Amino acid sequence: MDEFEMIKRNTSEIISEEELREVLKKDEKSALIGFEPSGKIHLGHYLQIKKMIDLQNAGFDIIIILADLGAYLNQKGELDEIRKIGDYNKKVFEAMGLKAKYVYGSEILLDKDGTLNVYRLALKTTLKRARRSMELIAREDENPKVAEVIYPIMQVNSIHYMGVDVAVGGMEQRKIHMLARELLPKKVVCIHNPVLTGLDGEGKMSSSKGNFIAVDDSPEEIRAKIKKAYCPAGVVEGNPIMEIAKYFLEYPLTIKRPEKFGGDLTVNSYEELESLFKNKELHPMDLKNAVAEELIKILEPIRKRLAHHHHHH
Ligand SMILES: N[C@@H](Cc1cc(Cl)c(O)c(Cl)c1)C(=O)O
Numbered sequence: 001m002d003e004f005e006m007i008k009r010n011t012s013e014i015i016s017e018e019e020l021r022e023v024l025k026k027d028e029k030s031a032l033i034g035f036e037p038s039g040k041i042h043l044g045h046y047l048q049i050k051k052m053i054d055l056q057n058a059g060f061d062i063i064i065i066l067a068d069l070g071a072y073l074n075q076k077g078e079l080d081e082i083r084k085i086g087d088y089n090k091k092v093f094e095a096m097g098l099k100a101k102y103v104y105g106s107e108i109l110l111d112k113d114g115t116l117n118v119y120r121l122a123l124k125t126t127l128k129r130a131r132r133s134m135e136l137i138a139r140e141d142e143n144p145k146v147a148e149v150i151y152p153i154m155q156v157n158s159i160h161y162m163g164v165d166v167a168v169g170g171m172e173q174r175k176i177h178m179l180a181r182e183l184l185p186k187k188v189v190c191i192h193n194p195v196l197t198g199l200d201g202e203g204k205m206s207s208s209k210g211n212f213i214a215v216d217d218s219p220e221e222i223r224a225k226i227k228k229a230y231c232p233a234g235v236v237e238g239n240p241i242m243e244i245a246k247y248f249l250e251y252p253l254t255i256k257r258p259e260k261f262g263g264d265l266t267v268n269s270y271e272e273l274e275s276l277f278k279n280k281e282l283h284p285m286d287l288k289n290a291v292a293e294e295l296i297k298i299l300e301p302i303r304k305r306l307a308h309h310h311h312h313h
Contacts, residue, residue, distance in 0.1 A: 003058040007191070010247055011051065012171050015181070015190040023165045023189055024058065031055045031166035031191075034065030034105065034158060036076060037086035041093075042212035044170075044196045044205040047247055049096045051168060051193055062100035063162050064093060069105045070154060073147040075139045079106070092215060095305040108161050109154060117160065121153045121183055133179055136172035156180045159188055171195050172204075196247070197240040201230025205240070213244075216303045219296045226292040231284040236274055241284070241291050246270045248298055255282065255290045 001009070003024055004017075014020055023029050033052055035045065056062050066086035072079050083104065090102045109115050130149035138148050152175075159167050159180050167177055168191045177190040195204050198211040205212045210225055217225070231241045245253070253273065255265040262281065267273045276282040 006054050007051075007058055009054070010047075010194070011191055012194045013174070013190075013192045015177070015192075019187070019189045020166070020191075026165070028061070029059065029166070030061040030063060030162070030164040031168055032063040032065055032159065032162050032164045033168040034067045034070065034155060035089060036067050036071035036074060037082050037089050038207060039085055039088075040207045040212060040214045041089060041216070042205055042207065042214045043244065043248065044212070045089075045092075046096065046215055047196055048168065048170065048193050049093055049098055051191070052100070053096070053098055055166065055168070056099055060166065062098065063164060064090070064098075064100045064102045065105050065158050065162075066090065066102060067105045067155075067158075069109055070151055073151050073154070074137070075141070075147075091309065092302075092306065095302050095309070096215070103162075105154060105158055108158055112161070114157075114161060117157050118150075118153055121156055122150075124183055125149075125153055125156075125179065129175075129179060133175035135175070137176075152176045152179060156183050160184045165189060166191060168193070194247075197230075197238050197243055199225055199229040199240050201238060201240060213295065213299075215299050216306055217299070218303075222296050222299070223292045226288050226295070227285075229288065231288060233284055234278060234280045236278055241287055242274065242277060244291055244295065245273055245287070249291070249294050253290065253294065255286055257283075257286045261286070 004021060008014060031052065033048060052062050066089060068079060068082045068086055071082050076082055086104060093100065109118060127149055130152050133152045134148055155176050156179055166189045167180065169177065171192045171194060174192055181187045198205040199213065200211045210228065213222060213225060226241065229241055231239055236242050251267065251269050253267045255267060257263065257265060267276065277287060
């Protein structure tokens with residue numbers, strides 16, 4: 001594959017592909033993604049960091065925004081707690097093999113103006129668009145706060161401030177990104193990753209108990225959580241185990257069994273795996289066992305790299 005294909009692989013949309021091809025011609029180019037700091041870093045994060053690595057392998061300079069003010073505004077807690085988690089997240093992303101520059105969103109909105117541009121954008125942004133852009137983002141609040149409509153403006157400002165060619169995020173960020181293309185003098189190319197279903201099969205992967213696989217989870221925790229995941233036979237849509245096979249696994253993939261069941265199974269592509277599962281010729285428990293074992297191998301260097309630091313040895 002060429003650079004465009006490597007970047008596009010496993011994305012949900014690129015706005016626009018034509019604009020991306022032009023960016024790829026530049027000698028210098030940069031991309032950002034922002035994260036609200038999270039106590040657990042899970043496959044949802046990993047999916048997107050993998051995409052940032054694709055960009056880095058295509059010669060992009062990578063900027064990671066640790067969105068401490070964003071998280072603060074979105075009711076994640078006190079700023080100092082949030083920043084401590086942010087620093088931990090940086091270590092995890094480093095342990096994933098990412099080469100990037102890391103900045104706190106508060107650095108922007110406080111130390112430059114910069115701060116002033118937030119006010120300028122607020123003049124241009126309707127309350128309606130701001131609130132609508134937060135639908136898939138904002139924490140639940142019966143009495144929605146001013147904080148909610150400041151959040152998207154801040155994200156648009158960070159994009160402008162960092163002067164990047166590309167902004168990356170999950171599909172939930174798309175409306176904020178559409179605002180960014182309307183509000184800033186230069187239109188940023190937007191790359192959106194799919195939303196990873198949680199292990200429970202109920203909405204996105206999040207840090208709720210048993211609902212995520214964290215990159216530093218122990219092998220026994222990975223087996224246990226995969227074993228109890230939502231995964232109905234023949235069902236590919238909304239199936240978090242099939243999603244994991246699609247987004248993280250390498251092929252050919254060998255699936256141990258049985259052989260009253262079709263015997264050992266060597267699957268050459270995800271598309272083949274999908275066909276097998278869809279036609280009910282591969283049972284959930286066999287899929288789960290393989291996915292768990294491969295995921296343990298995939299995440300092992302990350303876990304070890306973290307522990308290797310989490311001493312000084
Ligand atoms: N909206 C992003 C977080 C984020 C990212 C950037 Cl870059 C921001 O500037 C702000 Cl405020 C917030 C998320 O859902 O994780």
